[PDB]
Amino acid sequence: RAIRPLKLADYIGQPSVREQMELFIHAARGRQEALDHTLIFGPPGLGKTTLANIIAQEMGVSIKSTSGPVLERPGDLAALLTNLEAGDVLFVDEIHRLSPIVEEVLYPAMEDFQLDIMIAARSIKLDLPPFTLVGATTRAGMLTNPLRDRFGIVQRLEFYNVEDLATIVSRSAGILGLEIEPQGAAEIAKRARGTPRIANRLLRRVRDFAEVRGQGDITRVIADKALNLLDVDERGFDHLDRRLLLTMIDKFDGGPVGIDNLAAALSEERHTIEDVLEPYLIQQGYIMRTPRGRVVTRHAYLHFGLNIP
Amino acid sequence: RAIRPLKLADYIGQPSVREQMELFIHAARGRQEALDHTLIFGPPGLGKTTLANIIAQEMGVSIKSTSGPVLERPGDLAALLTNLEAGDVLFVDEIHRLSPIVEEVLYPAMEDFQLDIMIAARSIKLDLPPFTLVGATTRAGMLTNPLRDRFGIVQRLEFYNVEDLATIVSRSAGILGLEIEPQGAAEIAKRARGTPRIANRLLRRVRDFAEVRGQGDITRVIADKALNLLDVDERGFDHLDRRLLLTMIDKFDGGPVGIDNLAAALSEERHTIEDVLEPYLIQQGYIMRTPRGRVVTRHAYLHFGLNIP
Amino acid sequence: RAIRPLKLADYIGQPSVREQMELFIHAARGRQEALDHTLIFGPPGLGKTTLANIIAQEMGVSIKSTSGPVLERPGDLAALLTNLEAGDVLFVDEIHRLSPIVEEVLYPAMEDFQLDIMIAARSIKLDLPPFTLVGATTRAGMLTNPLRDRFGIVQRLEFYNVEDLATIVSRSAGILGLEIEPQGAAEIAKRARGTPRIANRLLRRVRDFAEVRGQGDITRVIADKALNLLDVDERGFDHLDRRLLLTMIDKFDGGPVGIDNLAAALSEERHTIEDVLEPYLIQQGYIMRTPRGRVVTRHAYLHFGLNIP
Amino acid sequence: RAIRPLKLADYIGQPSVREQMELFIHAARGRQEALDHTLIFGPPGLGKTTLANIIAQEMGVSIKSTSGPVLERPGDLAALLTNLEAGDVLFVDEIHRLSPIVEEVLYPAMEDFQLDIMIAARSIKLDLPPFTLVGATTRAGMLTNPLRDRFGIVQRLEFYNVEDLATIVSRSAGILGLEIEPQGAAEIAKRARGTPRIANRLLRRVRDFAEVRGQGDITRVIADKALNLLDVDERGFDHLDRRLLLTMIDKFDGGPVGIDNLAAALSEERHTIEDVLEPYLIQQGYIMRTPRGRVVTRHAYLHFGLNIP
Amino acid sequence: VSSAEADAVSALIALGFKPQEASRAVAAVPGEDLSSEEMIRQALKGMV
Amino acid sequence: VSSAEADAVSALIALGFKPQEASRAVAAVPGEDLSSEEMIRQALKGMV
Amino acid sequence: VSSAEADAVSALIALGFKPQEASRAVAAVPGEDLSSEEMIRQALKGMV
Amino acid sequence: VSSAEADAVSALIALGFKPQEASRAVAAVPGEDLSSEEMIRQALKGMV
DNA sequence: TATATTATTATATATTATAATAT
DNA sequence: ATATTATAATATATAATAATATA
């Protein structure tokens, strides 16, 4: 109902995610048991912290939704440890971006809810109340696997299909109070590059654009106006993406050839291309840079309908 | 409240290795001498310090739990050696990470318990008390050949046998108070991942399942419900792993692959895959890793009825 | 307090090798001058450092022991040469991994102990004292051809046969005061790949077995029960070795795959893999090496009662 | 005293190559110039370093020598060519291993003995004094054909027959001054392998029996006990060649075999075997070269005592 | 301060603080004649 | 410094200890001109 | 720091040497009253 | 100190030794009455 | 004097590289 | 007979610390 919805049925995410470890934890809560540790991870900008905050609020427990790179010091870590009580829960964002001292002071906490601090000098035995840490990282491959042993639950994120995207945009437009057509929801889902939280941001932007030039209802001409304004159509092709693929088909026409060469042809930084442009079409069956080189399917050619055998 | 076998005789899971370590315990006690240097290596995270504490209990003498960063200088380890007494022991870790100056300092320390140091050149000879030098690393292969040859006993560590894994699962469920089934215990031993910590995490999660889905009861069918609602295969595959298999047999169709293309198409960090999902199946051997691209082995082909080039 | 042999006849194995080296010893005695520089090639487990020490005492010269991996810069070499004097010798091992500038420094240093490297200004004319550099590497193929050609004494060090290994076990038990049955000596000699270092280690394990489970000296029955308790068959198999055998004959059908793939499957080093495998695999004829891979023989497959398909 | 050949009369080698280099030197001296860039592709070191020393002796100038892989940078080559004076001799072994930029810089050196480099880019014009480049490499087959096209003088080398061993016995043993029997020299040639280096080793090692025993008897077993094992049926070959014949006959049946298959069977470098053992064994008619496989001749079967397949 | 507060301050510098802020944290919420753990716990929420 | 003290200081310097703390530990516990091994033992008995 | 020095550095860069090595080589020799080509030649003749 | 000592220092520097400890090894055993190769030998025996 | 202004010691990270292979 | 590029090293921009003239 807010900018970020609250109830779990508001955000019908991955049906496996929506089914597993939600009804299970809803039944398991109230058993006088402190919950164990949990990861949600995937592409960035997907509001995984919002999902964890949601999980905490149907658990009805005090939560401190925190960011790891903000909390670099062990002192604020211990401050958040003494902030909560028995059987509580803590939320941290981007745990993999921390100084090691964070992890070797949270290791006794993971072990036996213990705050071992050093001051011959001797370390001091300081127990902590039972708790829960949830992990909210973009990528946790660089996270150490002692932690991966300590964290008991992992959940991944993936690009959303058009049905989940359509349901999400319809629910969030009902949150936004729009008069969008179901065809409007489908066209908004197609224009968006998945990313349901960023898709919600795009829906808010498109709603502002439509309210600037009209009412809250969404019509196919308004969708075309937004697609031409944002230079991204329902095929998801960026203007730079469309221009570069037109350049590639204008010279090699699906010819499998090397990247440096195409980067010099486009006069663009190839690493920026690597980390932005082709992954998005690479999640679909569009771009297939081979050992011989780039291969683009004729499905992408169907944007203009010209292809060769 | 972590897992701990109280004695090496009480230890289960590697009954043969339990027999040789009982042999070693009786060798030290019956001869009333310091036990030989025993080389320990296996899984990286297993609570080796806890095992050393159990061995300390078996001897009845203390063991100074030390590691590579603990003994990065020869000075503090020499100080501990001076603080060592007759018939003691000293746990050492990250010996491969340790400097070669530490290695030459410990050469006379285990060479009949002596010490040689220089001061125009002058020689100073020192003696050391007899003890059992303990060398434990995650991988013993980085150790220099003369030092390991000068070392005595070598002990390999590994995850338990499938029957031993099921026995340990049954013991932990009795510790956890779960009304487990031996068929369910064998199911967990099949899904044991080679990791007793993650295995015990699985026992916790299926205990949650049997609390919320079963009537506080654990059977084979309850275990099958839990490990059908989750990422399950008796080898240890996940829907992560199933997705990797589908893409690998789908994108390049059982050929060598480009890791950048894998990360772009799969939409996960390749480092996360090669740190989490790849190494277990490499231990399973179901892939072969080439300098031109990793290809799955015949297990994936028979897993889906696929041909061989 | 060590049981290291220090006699020429102590390493009576490889009698043609020992006779030729005795001829070289009497040659150096009759020369009363600089020896030809020596590159002995031989896999470990054989006491090759002990052999270098023994021939150094037969020269009546002091020996300094180090290796090629230890050295990293020709200034360290020059320091070692200055420490050596007339009538000295320096044990060097694994010279293949060494900086080349060390090699061009040592070319005149083995020509006539000379060093004429550049400081332009005045260059050095370092003519070293008369002492001959020796090498005790494992394989000379990975050694450079100019260094292999320039060094005078070259010899293969080989695993010892059952009679010499049993005699070595008997004489070491004599130093240890222990008594061995000749049949037990024969079985432990034909086990452990016929290598005196591993033979002595096995002797220590078997005498510990006779200290714990036995009540006296070692017989054939006591030794056999020791090997069965240690899970050592007539082939001297290790548990990791049996695991590798199972993987190569089952997962890979003889294993026609490179050493990198199998070493990663074990998660162990290439050098560790080979120096375990070849000294027993080659002498038993259970695997050969192909550019496709170290594929096992039919003999290895039929060892476990498996018929070749 | 240097036992190595100094003058061309002292040189022992191919008479045809000797007359060819004599007429090259006469043509150079008749032009009042140094010898031009002579290409000598064949056995590296054997008759190549000695040939460069012959050129230095005939021209009466200082000689500087290096290697192919040593000169990684063209700037180093330009530095040494600037340091080379007029008419000086340069010996580079393995000239085929140069990076192409080194060869591009080197092309004016055998064009007109000047640094007429072809290179934001400035053509440096260094005063390059005339010099003789002793082009040494394994063969001209893998040589770059601009380089092989630009060499003014081209010649070859071959492994020598028993005449070089006879001339070595005539010359260097007289330089040694100790008695050698003529038929004793002939039976020494059973293992001399037609090699001047092996002949030098035999000259150094015949003295071994003379200094162990003052009686000085000369028999066939006395001449063989320097290398007591015969290591051959007859005429030159060694234990390594014995292993080669064993793996051709017992394993590869003496018939066709992949070159890499035989190389991995030897567990040795293909290039090392092909440069050392292959051409001499082909010379005595033990192997013929075929692209489909390395098959051995009638000599290999008949010397082994078995029938010809 | 007492031995408990002194050990607390030593732990505070030992984890990264500086002595004067440890001192005013102790002085803000002083502990009286009990074990160190409880009032260091209110100090660590008192420092928030 | 005595011969045993100087040898012990050089030994602890080679062991990685700072020369000041090595000299303090060597001159603190043992007596004067005692056996080098035992006073090295006593100097290295110290811990933090 | 000189026009001839800069020309020598650029020539050694074009010849394959590193700019840092070219600077070290042109600073290693005190080339004075000489042309750039001959100063480069004596610099190559200098160390070797 | 003489030209042999400076040549020894420069040769040890070009060999890769650190200049301050190379200079200390040279100055500890100078070749005032003996050759540069001999005092380089004695210096290289200093740090073994 | 303490302070900005020069030295000099690690540490990933965007580079260079090769092989083997389709093509 | 080109390229290409999938794995492998590598070298320096950016962190740090230690003298040093100067109002």
Residue numbers in the entry:
A (entry chain M), B (entry chain P), C (entry chain O), D (entry chain N): 22 to 140, 145 to 334
E (entry chain C), F (entry chain D), G (entry chain A), H (entry chain B): 154 to 201
What does the paper say about this structure?
Holliday junction (HJ) is a four-way structured DNA intermediate in homologous recombination. In bacteria, the HJ-specific binding protein RuvA and the motor protein RuvB together form the RuvAB complex to catalyze HJ branch migration. During homologous recombination, the RuvB hexameric motors are attached to the RuvA-HJ core complex through the interactions with RuvA domain IIIs (RuvAD3) and thereby drive HJ branch migration and strand exchange between the two homologous DNAs (Iype et al., 1994; Iype et al., 1995; Adams and West, 1996; Wald et al., 2022). Here, we describe the cryo-Electron Microscopy (cryo-EM) structure of the RuvAB-HJ intermediate complex from P. aeruginosa.
In the cryo-EM structure of PaRuvB-dsDNA complex, the four PaRuvB subunits pack against with each other using a binding interface similar to that used for crystal packing. The intersubunit interaction involves E40 and R52 on α2 of one subunit and D233 and R238 on α11 of the other subunit. In particular, the arginine finger R175 (equivalent to R174 of EcRuvB) is located on this interface and approaches to the β-phosphate of ADP in the neighboring subunit. The four PaRuvB subunits form an asymmetric spiral and encircle 22 bp of HJ arm, and two of them intimately contact the DNA minor groove with their β-hairpins in domain C, involving resides R314, R317 and R319. Furthermore, because the β-hairpin is in close proximity to both DNA strands, we propose that R317 may bind a backbone phosphate from the first strand, while R314 and R319 may interact with two consecutive phosphates from the second strand. Structural analysis revealed distinct subdomain orientations of the four PaRuvB subunits. The angle between domains N and C defined by the Cα atoms of G165-V186-T314 increased from 34° for RuvB3 to 52° for RuvB1. The conformation for RuvB4 could not be unambiguously defined due to the poor electron density on the N-terminal part. Despite that, structural comparisons showed that the overall conformations of RuvB3 and RuvB4 are close to the crystal structure of ADP-bound RuvB, implying that these two DNA-free subunits are probably in ADP-bound state. Thus, the two subunits RuvB1 and RuvB2 are likely in ATP-bound state.
